From a paper:
The Ras proteins are master regulators of cell proliferation and survival that transduce growth stimuli emanating from cell-surface receptors to cytoplasmic kinases responsible for orchestrating a comprehensive cell division program. Ras proteins are cytosolic, membrane-bound GTPases that bind guanine nucleotides and are regulated by their nucleotide state: guanosine triphosphate (GTP)–bound Ras adopts a conformation that binds Ras effector proteins with high affinity, leading to their activation and downstream signaling, whereas guanosine diphosphate (GDP)–bound Ras adopts a conformation that cannot bind effectors and thus is inactive. Here, we report our initial findings on an alternative approach, one that exploits directed evolution to discover miniproteins having extraordinarily high affinity for the most functionally relevant surface of Ras, the effector domain. High-resolution crystal structures demonstrate that the miniproteins bind Ras as a dimer and interact via a distinct binding mode that captures the Ras effector domain in an open conformational state, which can be stabilized by insertion of a proline at Asp-38 in Ras.
As oncogenic Ras signaling is mediated by the GTP-bound state, we asked whether we could improve the nucleotide selectivity of the 225-11 miniprotein to favor binding to KRas-GppNHp. We prepared a scanning mutagenesis library that systematically randomized pairs of adjacent amino acids throughout the miniprotein sequence and then performed YSD with orthogonally labeled KRas-GppNHp and KRas-GDP targets. After two rounds of sorting for library members with improved selectivity for KRas-GppNHp, the screen afforded a population with a consensus mutation of A30R, located at the miniprotein residue closest to the γ-phosphate in the KRas/225-11 structure. A30R bound more strongly to both KRas-GppNHp and KRas-GDP but with a 2-fold overall improvement in selectivity for KRas-GppNHp. The crystal structure of 225-11 A30R bound to KRas-GppNHp revealed that the mutant arginine residue of the primary miniprotein protomer forms hydrogen bonds with two bound water molecules that solvate the γ-phosphate. GDP lacks the γ-phosphate, and Arg-30 is disengaged from the nucleotide in the KRas-GDP/225-11 A30R structure; thus, this interaction likely contributes to the improved nucleotide selectivity of this miniprotein mutant.
Numbering used by the authors:
A (entry chain A): 1 to 29, 36 to 166
B (entry chain B): 3 to 32
C (entry chain C): 2 to 32
The structure:
């Protein structure tokens, strides 16, 4: 697998676009590019990123688009409890589309640079530990853990 | 905001780059 | 391994979807 399809899912305003932009460009503020060549664990690989945008809706095409993805990032905001609440929702949707219980997935806690938090790290770790998926706190603004989140998702795909 | 066609002279890499942008565009216009 | 042809501006969203599906299939087999 020299090529990887990655889909970023999450609530509106959690920073999915900012995470993708801070991966490709890579700076913090764009549909210019969604593709990057990087080296992970001594092996080069190409990454295609689907930055899911807009309200959730029924769509046969969107299902096909997500089904193309091999790995999924579940992003929530630490200052948004409601975004963390919807994590179970995005997970079930992914399992529904991929038609599998074991889908390569990584739980992402974004905006960890903000001093005011509503969801603690432990509460998020316990959720990811029950799913059997890794959990990484990221910050698109300070470019903290951005690469770590996507690269770990690549590891998850390689293990499966 | 629809991505321009890669063209006939486009290489495989150019097609991959286009496909990724088309991937996000098609999802968004649904 | 037939390279698909990119549709024009007159093309609909479905046309782009078709080309999207064909391109993915093409890029997979040539690689
Ligand atoms: N402090 C901070 N702000 C962020 C971060 N990620 C995104 N934002 C802010 O969130 C706003 C909207 O996020 P956006 O990427 O559009 O959310 P999306 O709906 O998932 O695409 C932007 O104006 C960013 O300034 C982060 O890691 N830290
Ligand atoms: Ca619809
Ligand atoms: Ca719609
Ligand atoms: Ca037509
Ligand atoms: Ca047609
Ligand atoms: Mg966005």
């Amino acid at each position: 697998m020299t090529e990887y399809k990655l889909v970023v899912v999450g609530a509106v305003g959690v920073g999915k676009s900012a995470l993708t932009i801070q991966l490709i460009q890579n700076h913090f503020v764009i549909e210019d590019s969604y593709r990057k060549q990087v080296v992970i664990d001594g092996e080069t690989c190409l990454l295609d990123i689907l930055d899911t945008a807009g309200q959730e809706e029924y769509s046969a095409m969107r299902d096909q688009y997500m089904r193309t993805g091999e790995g999924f990032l579940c992003v929530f905001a630490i200052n948004n409890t409601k975004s963390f609440e919807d994590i179970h929702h995005y997970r079930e949707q992914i399992k529904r589309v991929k038609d599998s219980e074991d889908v390569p997935m990584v739980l992402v806690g974004n905006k960890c640079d903000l001093p005011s938090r509503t969801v603690d790290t432990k509460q998020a770790q316990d959720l990811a530990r029950s799913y059997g998926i890794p959990f990484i706190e990221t910050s698109a603004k300070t470019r903290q853990g951005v690469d770590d989140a996507f690269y770990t998702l690549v590891r998850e795909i390689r293990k499966h | 905001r629809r991505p321009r066609c890669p063209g006939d002279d486009a290489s495989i890499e150019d097609l991959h780059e286009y496909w990724a942008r088309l991937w996000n565009y098609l999802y968004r216009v649904a």
